[PDB]
Ligand binder design. Structure first.
Ligand SMILES: CC[C@@H](O)[C@H](NCc1c(COP(=O)(O)O)cnc(C)c1O)C(=O)O
Ligand SMILES: CC[C@@H](O)[C@H](NCc1c(COP(=O)(O)O)cnc(C)c1O)C(=O)O
Lengths: 399, 399
């Protein structure tokens, strides 16, 4: 029995036990563009309440046509990293508009938020330095930190007192520079970081504050600029990392926006920036028009707030443990992974597209459905969906 | 002086330190689509010989039109990882086409080749297993290995006897499974991994064989299938990672190709596939068009081979060191960084766009210019660049 084939057997044995534990993820094949309603290849058309299409720009006609013109004017692929021959005027234009949009002096584009985080800490920090992370920080942040030589501390989830204990200890352990880093809005539970307390606690110790803004840019704040606008620190952030693939288009790309020494050093030394393809001209192009939309009127994010409150207060009145609020991410815990596959399946049958969240996406035994609001939803969809949740929740024992 | 501001000072000190060493990289701002000739925002038209656009597909109008069609039928962005609502029929289809093209059972799409490597080793390997890398492996492989728990070995560049010395130690050290991993075609020197030998070495020790094919897929091997085709080992590769951002379109996205059960574990556990956006609809649909183009005729790859055989023989007949290979990557070693900044800039005055490679992209003391050949270059541009190389080659002491 060969060594290579025992490996493949090991892998097959692993797959089985993932299925046994109710943890195997099955892909639905959508046959349509992204939007408020969606159709799998099988033919069924369902309400989509689990996309990152927070502002509904993934298939917004003026975003689609801006990408079209980018294809005409600036081509399909650049097949280069930025410093070689992958820099077009659009990249410089969009890095500018984001810096303006976000409150920072420059911005550096990446292929994703995942790679913006991956290349952040290693380039800026060393073994003598520290990174303090909220316990539930996103996997891409944990992997950025793992790739750096910095010392690591976690503070308990959104616990501002534990943030002080770690900052105390890191000072005590002798940290040169400290960077406090956290999801702006957290992926799996929707809660909002307390950037107002943190920027103050960071100011006592001289620490830096960085935030991952994927679940905030475009629709958090009065003018949609970020979680920092929503906590009144706009322009007081050392490091923003974020995506172009959530609210701002949903195609690809990410970014780090920081002072200008940072951005300049990231361009010089950040590994994904040096070593991975530049963003495609269509994406950069359509993102520049995305910023034209959101800077011209706050309506879409306003309709998002409305859709979110209506549906959060609705799931509340049905007995779900969902607080009233304006978090477009609405977590619905079912703990059992199998009971998550069922609830998502049953809600499919009832006309609602959600997907189970289980390990390793969330901790074993803390499985959930993550509802996700859009500006796209009209009230007969939000209503027909509330119906779907009340029934399937009743059948499965959730209310 | 506060700690935060102290940190910014260290950033600018190293920003100035990097300029002082002449190691600072300045972005040239292309104003046109990627092409064999390109115009900076200054209006000057120049011959591009430093892109990964080997087959000219980056602005190929049939590729461009497939992106136009994929936007109309399938939208701009999906704003979701694959397992939630980011799997369209296109991704499944493109995944079947890459597997058949490449000789493998299945294929998993990533947002870049960077992330394909980044999510590869940590998923398939454990503390008891070994990875054995060619010492010149791409930065994305190193980081993917650093993110895994496996035991690490490096062997001298293309050194088959060093490769055996490591597999001895890996086994001596008690490795369970063992993965030999190397660039198929090395980005920085154009050399071609000795895959037929490595397959034989691996069979002996019972190790898996993996290749990163970013500089091979589409044009290496008689049918452009890649380094494994070119070395008689088509169909006998355990793991292919790669990119859609070079010869297969140049826009965005990457992949890992392997057996069904390896790919299935990557879908269930690979961190960038779980936690980062799915490839955009327009990119997937254009990639499907790229495979129709390349499966229909080995022109382009035949044309590429010609253009390089001519341009190598060009610098051949001028006292340039044609160091190693038939390959479209022509490394013109100049060792000193400042000279490569000079030679790249001087050629820009002679009408040639080409860029200096120096630390940390290439080792200190081993700076260079990477000439990269495309199918697109017409004879006018070719021998016109041969002249600009001859002039500046003598003009700056290298000829
Ligand atoms: C100067 C920067 C170079 O590293 C670059 N190559 C990028 C690259 C990647 C990342 O591919 P992605 O773009 O992330 O899909 C993965 N593997 C290999 C073997 C590569 O050569 C180039 O040839 O310009
Ligand atoms: C189930 C997978 C989720 O983690 C996923 N997160 C994507 C994500 C990334 C990667 O962003 P990119 O897509 O690579 O730009 C970076 N930071 C944060 C805070 C994120 O939430 C989501 O919420 O859909």
């Amino acid at each position: 029995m060969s060594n290579a084939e025992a490996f493949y057997a090991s892998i097959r044995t692993e797959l089985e036990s993932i299925r046994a534990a109710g943890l195997f993820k099955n892909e639905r094949v959508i046959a349509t563009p992204q939007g408020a309603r969606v159709r799998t290849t099988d033919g069924r058309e369902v309400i989509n309440l689990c996309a990152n299409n927070y502002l509904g720009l993934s298939s917004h006609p003026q975003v689609i046509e801006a990408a079209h013109e980018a294809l005409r004017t600036h081509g399909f692929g650049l097949s280069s990293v930025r410093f070689i021959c992958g820099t077009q005027d659009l990249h410089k234009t969009l890095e500018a508009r984001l810096s303006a949009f976000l409150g920072t002096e420059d911005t550096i584009l990446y292929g994703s938020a995942f790679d913006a985080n991956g290349g952040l800490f290693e380039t800026l920090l060393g073994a003598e330095d520290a990174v303090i992370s909220d316990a539930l920080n996103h996997a891409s942040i944990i992997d950025g930190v793992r790739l750096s030589k910095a010392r690591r501390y976690r503070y308990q989830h959104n616990d501002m007192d534990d943030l002080r204990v770690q900052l105390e200890q890191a000072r005590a352990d002798g940290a040169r520079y400290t960077l406090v880093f956290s999801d702006g809005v957290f992926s799996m539970d929707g809660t909002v970081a307390r950037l107002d307390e943190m920027r103050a606690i960071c100011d006592e110790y001289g620490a830096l504050l960085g935030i991952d803004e994927c679940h905030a840019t475009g629709f958090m704040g009065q003018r949609g600029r970020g979680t920092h606008e929503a906590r009144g620190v706009f322009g007081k952030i050392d490091i923003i990392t974020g995506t172009l693939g959530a609210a701002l288009g949903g195609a690809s790309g990410g970014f780090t926006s920081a002072r200008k020494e940072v951005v300049a050093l990231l361009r010089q030394r950040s590994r994904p920036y040096l070593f991975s393809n530049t963003v495609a001209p269509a994406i950069v192009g359509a993102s520049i028009a995305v910023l034209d939309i959101l800077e011209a009127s706050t309506e879409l994010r306003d309709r998002l707030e409305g859709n979110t409150r209506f549906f959060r207060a609705g799931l509340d009145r049905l007995g779900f443990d969902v607080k009233a609020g304006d978090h477009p991410i609405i977590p619905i815990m079912v703990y059992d992974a199998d009971k998550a596959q069922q609830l998502a399946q049953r809600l499919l049958e009832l006309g609602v597209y959600v997907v189970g969240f289980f390990y390793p996406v969330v901790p074993k035994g803390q499985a959930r459905i993550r509802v996700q609001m859009s500006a796209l939803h009209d009230e007969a969809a939000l209503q027909a969906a509330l119906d779907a949740f009340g029934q399937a929740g009743r059948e499965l024992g959730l209310i």
